[PDB]
Amino acid sequence: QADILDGKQKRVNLNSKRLVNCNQVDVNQLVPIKYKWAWEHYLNGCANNWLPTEIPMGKDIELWKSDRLSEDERRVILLNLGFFSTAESLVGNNIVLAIFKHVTNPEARQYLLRQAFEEAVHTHTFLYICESLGLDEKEIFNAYNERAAIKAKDDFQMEITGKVLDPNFRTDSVEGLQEFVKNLVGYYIIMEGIFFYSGFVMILSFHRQNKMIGIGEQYQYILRDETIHLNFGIDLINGIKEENPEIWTPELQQEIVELIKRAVDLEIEYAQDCLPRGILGLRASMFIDYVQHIADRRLERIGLKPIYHTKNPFPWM
Amino acid sequence: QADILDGKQKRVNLNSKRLVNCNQVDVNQLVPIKYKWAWEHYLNGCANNWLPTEIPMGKDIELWKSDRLSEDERRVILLNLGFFSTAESLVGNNIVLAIFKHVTNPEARQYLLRQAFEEAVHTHTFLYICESLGLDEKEIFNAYNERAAIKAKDDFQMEITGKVLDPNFRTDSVEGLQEFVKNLVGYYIIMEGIFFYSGFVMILSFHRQNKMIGIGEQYQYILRDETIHLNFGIDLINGIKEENPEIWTPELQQEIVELIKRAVDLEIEYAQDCLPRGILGLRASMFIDYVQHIADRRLERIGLKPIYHTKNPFPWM
Ligand SMILES: [Fe+3]
Ligand SMILES: [Fe+3]
Ligand SMILES: [Fe+3]
Ligand SMILES: [Fe+3]
Ligand SMILES: [Pb+2]
Ligand SMILES: [Pb+2]
């Protein structure tokens, strides 16, 4: 039996748990779980475990070093490796330094720990593809300083990363929680849900034609993870809105649509840099449509109306 | 080629990387890796991947529900599940909320992301063992509020968890970095390296006698992970000391020995609570010796002299 009798009064009540600002209850005990969707995404992520180096790169190395790829095909590969190599760190660092501190719920934190480890796996994937192909990884990982279209995306991402890191930042004010929700939209909806999906189409287009299949297979594994990351983020944003409805004002709704519009513009500029002429039958115009179409699907999932209405040119995605 | 020419000046120099207070260099680019030991522990951890529920619990359930275990054997199981169920969260939360922010180095952060996900796997293990055995997990997870010997350990652990969480905490002062090193000693050397190893002996003693082998096999997997956690922590503490020698003063050295002495006292009290009479040929006196012996081995690894000199009564550990 208990030898500290008062301790029995401290067991956590299911109905007292909340996703943010929950400080009146012990957030170190996992049970009783309230947000079962977080536990399910955690189990699903654990089941998807993979390591990049189980995927062979020999065929990719022989093709990359041959004269069989055009300069335009190489450029698509190099720009995506440049963008993804540091963006995975940007996402993993934000989960840990910004999101976990403020999501005051153990089962959602359990999922965040799996998501941040998967982003570490994604970074390892890019080091492995650089070292396998013989690229100078110090140049590829610094692409966000050397290539304008990539720097513009990442500088935009910092516009929602800085506030939540301030030593005095708190979510126990309407404005503070709105700022935290914009960070979640920026990382889950925009970086993982729009910026990365655009690079997936480009790389998976090579894989579909039996080219650079080792890199293609790694991106298939990253997309399977990203699908759960986006789904968790959408559940967390909608769960926070439901529990704190006074933050979902027309002003915040419009600021979120403006952020997504800005992100679509930057991603179209990056697709143009990736495809100045076109490869594999892809043209940059197909991206103006695809990026706009997925932006609309992300707006719908968080309760906002589509704004572009464009059809999807890549049904296989 | 680069379309932002100045960006080439931003590539990271290997010699400018440091484990803490490194803010003059881009800490989002993984390369060039400097602390190869961190990358190696990260690869070794990834290779050790396991899920608790791949270990069958049927034989354990039948034994636990039979009248074949004594009350004294059940007490050892219940008290260890009570302590470990929330301590794994305490460790995972500290990695994320305290350690990662201040270890300003991407490859050490890559390892931290694997360690924090393994602590999430360890928490899942305890929920799974509770639900398999039919225990009321709300009682087991609240043991740190209901059982004095467990509460004393955890209240002690909070004595080095609180400072580093203050909004204004910084490591760019000698005192601030000393405080951060005491947090690392508290979690890696004391909680993972002394408190957990003592519970491992107790549980692995059942496994050696073919009892509760499903729980034993899970603890074998946790010990394999904990071995790397402790080794990484020892490398990180020694790396910080080497790079900031002015923090390793006789005053700090003596405060660390006093913390370890206090932890040994609390762990002996917990071993006595676990074994008021003795089971499986184990007696609590064997723990006074074992805890003292491992404390000495942890002191040696961070450059302090052994103080107890006791022999190890469990050579198989
Ligand atoms: Fe990722
Ligand atoms: Fe992601
Ligand atoms: Fe653990
Ligand atoms: Fe550990
Ligand atoms: Pb622009
Ligand atoms: Pb005492």
Instruction: Report CB contact under 8 Å: B89, A147.
Output: no
Q: Note whether A86 and A143 are within 8 A (CB).
A: yes
Query: Phi first, then psi: what are they for B2, rounded to 5°?
Result: -60, 135
Instruction: Report CB contact under 8 Å: A30, B93.
Output: no
Residues B31 and A140: their CA atoms lie apart, in Å, by: 10
Distance, C-alpha B123 to centroid of its chain: 13
Give strand pairing partners of B282: B279
Length of chain A: 317
Residues B235 and B189: their CA atoms lie apart, in Å, by: 11
Residues A201 and B97: their CA atoms lie apart, in Å, by: 36
Instruction: Report CB contact under 8 Å: B117, A114.
Output: yes
The candidate with the shortest Cα–Cα distance to A308, out of A268, A251, A252, is A268
Q: Note whether B140 and B81 are within 8 A (CB).
A: yes
Residues B198 and B271: their CA atoms lie apart, in Å, by: 8
Q: Which of A42, A111, A128, A270 is catalytic?
A: A128
Residues A130 and A52: their CA atoms lie apart, in Å, by: 12
| Determination technique for this entry | X-ray
N- to C-terminal Cα distance for chain B?
A: 57
Q: Note whether B46 and B197 are within 8 A (CB).
A: no
**Does the annotation place B255 within a ligand binding site?**
no
Instruction: Give Cα separations from B72 to A1, A58, B136, B137, B190 (angstroms).
Output: 13, 59, 19, 20, 27
Q: What is the CATH number of the domain that holds A237?
A: 1.10.620.20
Query: In angstroms, what separates the C-alpha of B106 from chain A's closest C-alpha?
Result: 9
The single-letter code of the amino acid at A218 is Q
Cα torsion at B212, B216, B219, B221 (round to 10°)?
A: -130
Instruction: Report CB contact under 8 Å: A89, B4.
Output: no
Q: Note whether B271 and B291 are within 8 A (CB).
A: yes
A41 CA → ligand 1 middle, Å: 15
Residues A236 and A115: their CA atoms lie apart, in Å, by: 13
Q: Which of B128, B187, B270, B290 is catalytic?
A: B128
Partners of B101 on chain A (C-beta within 8 Å) are 96-97
Per DSSP, the three-state class of B105 is: coil
Give strand pairing partners of B279: B282
The single-letter code of the amino acid at B111 is Y
Residues B138 and B140: their CA atoms lie apart, in Å, by: 6
A253 CA → ligand 4 middle, Å: 42
- The vertex-A91 CA angle with B1 and B42, nearest 5°, equals 95
Number of H helices, E strands in chain A: 13, 0
Q: Which two tokens stand for residue A180?
A: 């935290």
Query: In angstroms, what separates the C-alpha of A122 from chain B's closest C-alpha?
Result: 11
Chain breaks in chain B (C to N over 2.5 A) after: none
Q: Note whether A69 and A63 are within 8 A (CB).
A: yes
Residues B249 and B185: their CA atoms lie apart, in Å, by: 15
The single-letter code of the amino acid at B48 is N
Q: Note whether B236 and B108 are within 8 A (CB).
A: yes
Buried b (16+ CB within 10 A) or exposed e, A147-173: bebbbbbbebbeebbeebeeeebebee
Residues B50 and B158: their CA atoms lie apart, in Å, by: 30
Cα nearest neighbour of A39 on chain B: B124
The single-letter code of the amino acid at A39 is W
The candidate with the shortest Cα–Cα distance to A100, out of A117, A81, A123, is A117
HSE on the CB side for B26, CA within 13 Å?
22
- Domain containing A266 equals 1-317
- The vertex-B39 CA angle with B37 and B45, nearest 5°, equals 100
B306: preceding bond cis by omega (within 30 degrees):
no
- The vertex-A122 CA angle with A121 and A127, nearest 5°, equals 95
- Name the residue with tokens 């495809």: A275
Q: Which two tokens stand for residue A134?
A: 């013989």
Residues B193 and A92: their CA atoms lie apart, in Å, by: 27
Q: Which two tokens stand for residue A227?
A: 């699908």
The candidate with the shortest Cα–Cα distance to A123, out of A157, A85, A149, A159, is A85
B128 catalytic per annotation: yes
- Name the residue with tokens 């909608």: A238
- The vertex-B78 CA angle with B74 and B83, nearest 5°, equals 150
Per DSSP, the three-state class of B178 is: helix
Query: In angstroms, what separates the C-alpha of A30 from chain B's closest C-alpha?
Result: 8
**Does the annotation place A229 within a ligand binding site?**
yes
**Does the annotation place A217 within a ligand binding site?**
no
Residues A233 and B39: their CA atoms lie apart, in Å, by: 29
B196 CA → ligand 3 middle, Å: 8
Cα nearest neighbour of A101 on chain B: B97
Q: At what angle do helices B213-243 and B106-133 cross, to 10 degrees?
A: 160
A52: preceding bond cis by omega (within 30 degrees):
no
Per DSSP, the three-state class of A314 is: coil
Give strand pairing partners of A282: A279
A230 CA → ligand 2 middle, Å: 7
How many domains, in total, are found in chain B? Answer: 1
The candidate with the shortest Cα–Cα distance to A194, out of A127, A141, A260, A149, is A260
Please report which residue ranges of chain B form alpha helices under DSSP H: 36-47, 58-65, 71-94, 100-102, 106-133, 137-140, 143-146, 148-159, 174-184, 196-208, 213-243, 250-274, 284-301
Expressed in Å, this structure's resolution amounts to: 1.7
Residue A148, chain B, CB below 8 Å: the answer is yes
Q: Which two tokens stand for residue B85?
A: 């169920």
Q: Note whether A282 and A313 are within 8 A (CB).
A: no
B234 CB-near residues (< 8 Å, 6+ apart)? B188, B189, B301, B302
